[PDB]
């Protein structure tokens, strides 16, 4: 909407106070004009019609329980925008400052969140498996990364290309969590998953097998559930990314770690310059090797570590 840029204040899902960029015209709307062509957050009102209503508030204060998922969806979209712009020189998900739209309160007790090809959508969770999913910065950044993928590699959401698609989202969701630097880790969704159970998460990149996901190509899932295992076989790529960054020995193969920033540069270049809609795991290895070659040189430690990490997870 047309109005003047304002700064509201509220509390997120985890009870933390934060400022949010709003727009004033009669009401204060969750419309952040400071980033690209705007970040817009909507109320789906427990229905499944999308996007719903642009979030309107009478006083620019967002401390109600009902407001909390909207505060975090709006704020963490801003953090994710900042990461892509400041770290990768990418202006929004399309590289041309496309408006970022998110809807919260999707459906009733909905235990998921997703990018739908047009916008982000967050359930509130059922209070047992999840609390409102926008409370997790890694969740927000994971799903916005699907938009980046849509505009770049376009990895088809099935089988190995779909597992790469998922892993790319887990990788950048985690790198955004480190960028924001609040309780960062190599786990996925820990801030919103199972409020009654401490220390768990949806997936682990450092040890995918902790939740039964494969950490080696020889343990890959070949069935048809989950679009051919896109959230299962992502563990093989997540483990390789973790090893590239942090190093370690895995199934007797040693990997020299090169750190998170170089991991992000290598995978961002692979995603935007080399991967295609049908890339498989072997092609991802080749794309990552070539990306590290471009950035650091064919004789670099970085290239050698990429090779070691894919060797360690059984991907040639």
């Amino acid at each position: 909407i047309t109005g003047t840029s304002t700064v509201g204040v509220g509390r997120g899902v985890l009870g933390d106070q934060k400022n949010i960029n709003t727009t004033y015209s009669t009401y204060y709307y969750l419309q952040d004009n400071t980033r690209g062509n705007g970040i817009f957050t909507y109320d789906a009102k427990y229905r499944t019609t999308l996007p719903g209503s642009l979030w309107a508030d009478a006083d620019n204060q967002f401390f109600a329980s009902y407001d909390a998922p909207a505060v975090d969806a709006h704020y963490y979209a801003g953090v994710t925008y900042d990461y892509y712009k400041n770290v990768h020189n990418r202006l929004s998900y399309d590289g041309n400052n496309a408006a970022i739209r998110s809807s919260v309160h999707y459906s009733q007790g909905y235990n998921n969140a997703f990018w739908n090809g047009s916008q982000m959508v967050y359930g509130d969770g059922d209070g047992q498996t999840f609390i409102p999913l926008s409370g997790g910065i890694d969740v927000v950044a994971h799903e916005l990364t699907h938009a980046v993928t849509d505009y770049t590699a376009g990895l088809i959401y099935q089988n190995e290309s779909g597992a790469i698609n998922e892993a790319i989202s887990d990788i950048f969701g985690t790198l955004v969590e480190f960028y924001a630097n609040k309780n960062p880790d190599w786990e996925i969704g820990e801030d919103v998953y199972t409020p009654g159970i401490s220390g768990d998460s949806l997936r682990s990149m450092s040890d995918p097998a902790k939740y039964g996901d494969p950490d080696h190509y020889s343990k890959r899932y070949t069935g048809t559930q989950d679009n051919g295992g896109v959230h299962i076989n992502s563990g093989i790529i997540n483990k390789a990314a973790y090893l590239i960054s942090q190093g370690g020995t895995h199934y007797g193969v040693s990997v020299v770690g090169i750190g998170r920033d170089k991991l992000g540069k290598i995978f961002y270049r692979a995603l935007t310059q080399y991967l295609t809609p049908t890339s498989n795991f072997s092609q991802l290895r080749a794309a990552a090797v070539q990306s590290a070659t471009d950035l650091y040189g064919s004789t670099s430690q970085e290239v050698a570590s990429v090779k070691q990490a894919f060797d360690a997870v059984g991907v040639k």
Partner: peptide, 5 residues
């Protein structure tokens, strides 16, 4: 469905 299946 996307953060999980």
């Amino acid at each position: 469905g996307a953060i999980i299946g």
